[PDB]
Design a protein around this ligand. Structure first.
Ligand SMILES: NC(=O)[C@H]1CCCN(C(=O)Cc2cccc3sccc23)C1
Ligand SMILES: [Zn+2]
Length: 139
């Protein structure tokens, strides 16, 4: 679990979005595993606007933050899960590192701010749904 709180928006993994998120839906993209809902309280997080390929992510299955090198956001084949069939998930960045299903939502950050959230993993890899291109989160 986990979310990003920026302005009047809450960004979560689409597969983990609650009834409240869907009742206050702003935007959703199943191909990115993202959903954004509206909030009443102002969020304090800052979205990174960059091309960094190194950062630190929070891994709940280890209660630890790990530094990683990650690939540029791309279309990557993601295996079928109990939430989606097999498909290309877009805007995904992979790194070598530990992840387990409950780790979705952990934030990946660089010096410029929030880069994205854990979305995929397994076989010693972890994948992050990028949010840096969503410039509308800043207004
Ligand atoms: N975006 C997707 O298609 C999701 C859908 C449901 C959650 N997903 C998984 O549980 C795959 C996986 C395996 C093993 C470690 C980890 S850590 C995060 C994800 C994951 C993938
Ligand atoms: Zn950056």
């Amino acid at each position: 679990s986990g979310a990003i709180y920026v302005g009047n928006y809450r960004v979560v993994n689409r597969h983990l979005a609650t009834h409240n998120d869907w009742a206050n839906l702003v935007w959703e993209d199943s191909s990115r595993d993202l959903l954004v809902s509206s909030t009443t309280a102002q969020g304090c997080d800052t979205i990174a606007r960059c091309d960094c390929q190194t950062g630190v992510y929070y891994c709940s299955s280890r209660r630890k933050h790990y530094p990683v090198s990650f690939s540029k956001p791309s279309l990557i084949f993601v295996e079928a899960s109990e939430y989606y069939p097999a498909r290309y998930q877009s805007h995904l960045m992979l790194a070598v590192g530990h992840s387990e299903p409950g780790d979705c939502g952990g934030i990946l950050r660089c010096q410029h701010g929030v880069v994205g959230i854990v979305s995929t993993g397994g076989n010693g890899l972890v994948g992050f749904a990028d949010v840096r291109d969503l410039l509308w989160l800043d207004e």
